[PDB]
Amino acid sequence: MKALEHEKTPELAAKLAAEAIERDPWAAQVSQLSLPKLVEQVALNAWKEESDNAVCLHLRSSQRHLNNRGAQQKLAEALSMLKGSTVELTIVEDDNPAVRTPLEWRQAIYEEKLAQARESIIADNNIQ
């Protein structure tokens, strides 16, 4: 009609997300919270650090423009509904790759199939 072409394989991407959730407690938590779109993109562009009484979403500063307090407050109420108590939910902007976000995890699960086929040679070992 108009074009669509943007679904492509939403099944493959959601199946891939199932594995991400089956590995990542944060991806699982977000899917249980069932976030909308903007706030979902905030939760997606961040990896969830968790402290004694807080949850600090390390958002890739590469998408710092998604992070707004309007999202954080809605995210906070949702995280608090999950935790069943007040979560000190903050969004911090840390672009360092040392942890994978649930978005990057979905992507990384897919590439693990490809990477395992090269990492098998790492497992053939040399020094470890």
Curated annotation (Swiss-Prot):
Q: Which domain of life is it from?
A: Bacteria
Function, in words: Part of the beta sliding clamp loading complex, which hydrolyzes ATP to load the beta clamp onto primed DNA to form the DNA replication pre-initiation complex. DNA polymerase III is a complex, multichain enzyme responsible for most of the replicative synthesis in bacteria. This DNA polymerase also exhibits 3'-5' exonuclease activity. The gamma complex (gamma(3),delta,delta') is thought to load beta dimers onto DNA by binding ATP which alters the complex's conformation so it can bind beta sliding clamp dimers and open them at one interface.
- Return the similarity comment: Belongs to the DnaX/STICHEL family.
- Gene, per the UniProt record: dnaX
Mapped onto the parent protein, the portion here is 499 to 625 of 643
- Tell me the protein's name: DNA polymerase III subunit tau
Q: State the oligomer form and interacting partners.
A: The DNA polymerase III holoenzyme complex contains at least 10 different subunits organized into 3 functionally essential subassemblies: the Pol III core, the beta sliding clamp processivity factor and the clamp-loading complex. The Pol III core (subunits alpha, epsilon and theta) contains the polymerase and the 3'-5' exonuclease proofreading activities. The polymerase is tethered to the template via the dimeric beta sliding clamp processivity factor.
